[PDB]
Subunit: 136 residues, 4 copies
Amino acid sequence: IAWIALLLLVIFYVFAVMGTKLFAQSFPEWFGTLGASMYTLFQVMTLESWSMGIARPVIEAYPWAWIYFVSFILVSSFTVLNLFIGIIIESMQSAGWEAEDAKRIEQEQRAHDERLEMLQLIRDLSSKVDRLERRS
Amino acid sequence: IAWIALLLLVIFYVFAVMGTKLFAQSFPEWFGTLGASMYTLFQVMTLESWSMGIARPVIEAYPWAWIYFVSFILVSSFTVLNLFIGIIIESMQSAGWEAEDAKRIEQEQRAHDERLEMLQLIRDLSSKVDRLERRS
Amino acid sequence: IAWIALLLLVIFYVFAVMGTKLFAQSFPEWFGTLGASMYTLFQVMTLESWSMGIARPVIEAYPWAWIYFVSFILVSSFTVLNLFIGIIIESMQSAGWEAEDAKRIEQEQRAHDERLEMLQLIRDLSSKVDRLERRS
Amino acid sequence: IAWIALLLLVIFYVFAVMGTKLFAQSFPEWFGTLGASMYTLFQVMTLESWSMGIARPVIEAYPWAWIYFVSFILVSSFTVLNLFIGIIIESMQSAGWEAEDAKRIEQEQRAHDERLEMLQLIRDLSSKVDRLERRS
């Protein structure tokens, strides 16, 4: 799960230098610094005035910015979906299906100890009986 | 799961030509092209200034646009809910309940091999014994 | 699950007449009609300019409107959470844990048919043997 | 699950007095009272004009407010994720994996009653047979 939290903080990083490279020119409030894009893209990630506030006016200057915003939201919120699910799995198979996946791993092999002793008891009886057809 | 990703990209398409047909007239910034609606509806799908920015002013010109926006959000975000769930199911029954659904499919039939051999051993003993009530 | 889709469409209704009763006076664009509140509250439920657009200006006229908006969002989005979960449960215990809850209900009782026949075979052997201690 | 609903309503509280302490000075509409921050932070938690509306203008006065907003959203929406998951777990292991975790706790021990009676029957037979090699 936390092996993707690295990936997310890489995409966040990659796209922050992208926007600083592109829009630092004409949108210096949103993309002037690296640290200003780190904020803007967080705001863009949270989908609060992402388009009407940021994307639309940025797309007005460069139409090659349309994809930068769309692709960012697509990849960003998608690797959160992979991350949100990475907690539902690691949580529902840890508190429920990791304790049951061992209690039924034990209750199954606690009757292989029952069946395989009982088997021996029947063989110890096949030995006592088949030695009495050779004795009568 | 990805059999609905086609459906979503059909609803996205269907509604994009709808808005271009309707609003290309008076809202050319948002619905002028097919490609402008493809953007606007993505923005409307992400619920960022969807109403106050897009729907409200569009509903001011045509009140028959109220339903276009509401219905779009309802169907769109609903087939994402069907898609979001389509990953939680295909993920929690693949990494947990597809490996366990085979290890308990094997552990169950590894004792039918135990019970049905043991049965034979008892019949081989019923054969040795019921041939000794006919021998005494 | 769909037994709460009724409840949600009741809260939606209840609060729509509430807002039309209260704010139809001074906010006639948002709450003038029943059908205008049905839209506004849908927009409020989707959390798009819910506060800065609707609540804040409505709270400026009446401070007894603060709770109307907060309580609405709390109850509304909470019975969606009960509804969103009502599909995750009804879907993950239907496609996975309703077919397995019957295949293991059958595989369990397919060996009670094995154990209880084998038992009889041993009793049919206790009958053949304990009638040979009375015969020797 | 509801043991974190207390924690959330503590973070909500902690950060509300924080913002009233800091921003009551120059942003009295958003942070003037304790009760105004309780609203603003709810609006900030719902990510509706959180940055462009609240954070950005507040960051314009104090750049030491950037972290207050980011950290709030991070911790707040994260302990909702822990809370949202705390219902998926407590619901999917209660309606499905708490009734099955008892029906298979009973079906397992209803055949230990079978195997351990059958064992006795074989021993009662080893007693009858091994007393007939000492009798012939």
